Design a protein around this ligand. Sequence first.
Ligand SMILES: *C(=N)c1ncccn1
Ligand SMILES: *C(=N)c1ncccn1
Lengths: 304, 304
Amino acid sequence: SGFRKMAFPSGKVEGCMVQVTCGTTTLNGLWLDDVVYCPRHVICTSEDMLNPNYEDLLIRKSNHNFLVQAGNVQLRVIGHSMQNCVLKLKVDTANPKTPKYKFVRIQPGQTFSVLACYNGSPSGVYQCAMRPNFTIKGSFLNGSCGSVGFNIDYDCVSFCYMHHMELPTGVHAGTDLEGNFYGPFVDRQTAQAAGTDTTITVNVLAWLYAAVINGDRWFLNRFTTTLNDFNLVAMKYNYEPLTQDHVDILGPLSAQTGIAVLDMCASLKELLQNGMNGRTILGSALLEDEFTPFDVVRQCSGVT
Amino acid sequence: SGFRKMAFPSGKVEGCMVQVTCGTTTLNGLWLDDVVYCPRHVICTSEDMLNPNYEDLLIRKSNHNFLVQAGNVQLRVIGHSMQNCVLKLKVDTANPKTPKYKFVRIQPGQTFSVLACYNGSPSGVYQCAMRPNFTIKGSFLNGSCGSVGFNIDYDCVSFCYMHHMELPTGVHAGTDLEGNFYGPFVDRQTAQAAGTDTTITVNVLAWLYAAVINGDRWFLNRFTTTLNDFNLVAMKYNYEPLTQDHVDILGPLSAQTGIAVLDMCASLKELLQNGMNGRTILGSALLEDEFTPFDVVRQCSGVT
Ligand SMILES: *C(=N)c1ncccn1
Ligand SMILES: *C(=N)c1ncccn1
């Protein structure tokens, strides 16, 4: 028993982190096979970031200008190319620690683990979610760009995020491993404001099921609701609309606990309207939305 | 910017996890050099756990009864011994992935990362703290015994915890790597109730400094207090007493933010008396106590 904000074991990803330097800028790269992936803003000076023309800046760069170091040994760069907002540095050596991997573009509400790195070295691992406004709330200092987000399915790492920037509000923006930003963000130092950070309703419901499984049951009420009634309340509280797809995804948790999804919605509806009254659920005084229904099943069953 | 409950990168520890089976019981072991460490209750049937005599049960066990598997390859057990509540299984092969390591016994209030494992395989990593009542609030299912807690200092892993049991209240108890339980707990299936789970005051203060560094400043007030006045309030709210040692440890955070430790105590005093009023600090609606002052400095500086 017990329910924690758990990250995937990071070992498989640690074996892929390298340092990339271009001029005076050092950030992280991801070395998979004979390619090193990193944010293209590694070629920019802090000044260039104001209005960069990446194609033009890249013309002034040669393979020998990209310094790639894996541990304390230098990798030889034999090619370079830009794919959207990432640079792909072809090296002459395949990473011997390359795990089975995929590049996936996640949807909002999906969670992933981040291996925060500096100078190609791992500093920590934590669990995040792609917010509905396509930002993430991470922990990233200067030098952390190129740190990656991922999920693991037994032995295959699905990379879903690469860190590129912090908005003026302290929230984070980045790309998938094809270099496409999540959301409308651009790799430029300009006014970029995030939209409404709504709550991921299906994740809150999953976490309420995790609470019931783990013995925290005070919030269970005698009520039920409908998808339409619940959604009127969800709109009022800046919660994402709940769809029949979300109800179907919660089916296994509903089956395990014997609590119908709409009854759990009615419990959540009362928590939104009445508040927590100074009580906690799974050691939290707010409704947690960074556990997907899959994460709740995974953690409650001990998937390795 | 951003502040997350961050665990250490788990790779160095993943390379040490093995599966240990005795009879019908399978749990995890930690393989360092040519020794595999595991909870001694691996020799018990669920029935034996009611009132086990470990020395007597161990007489009926031979080296060949302890099945140790690292990945999918079997290790040969050439010796076994009991040290307090852990078994040390001498194997004929040194773990080639043994990192630099130490065995440390932590004090309450100290944090560590847990690599939850099942069948010798890592499932997830999360951050914990040794509670003042010597329990931990983990996420452990059946089969997770032998999972370990650790801290990393650059390349040296300091192992501080090995999971042994869950109390009837869903909280966890375990030992250091010398087999000595934290707190008064015993490896027996009997009535073991935990004491008061007080709040780790010095960690809350560290987290308030982390909040100021990261821009969450609404709780800063115009007041100050004394150690004695603050402690009267701390006692009332089941917070641990703050000592001059804790004030000294918070010195670097006080210096960085320009907020005197006693002024931060006065802010915390008002938060305890007035509550949060529906507001949050670092995305939390409660006062977080599982970040030490060292963790706040580490995360705010990007130690790798
Ligand atoms: C990412 N490494 C980064 N560091 C400093 C400024 C901007 N981005
Ligand atoms: C630890 N692995 C454990 N599993 C089942 C019951 C008790 N302890």
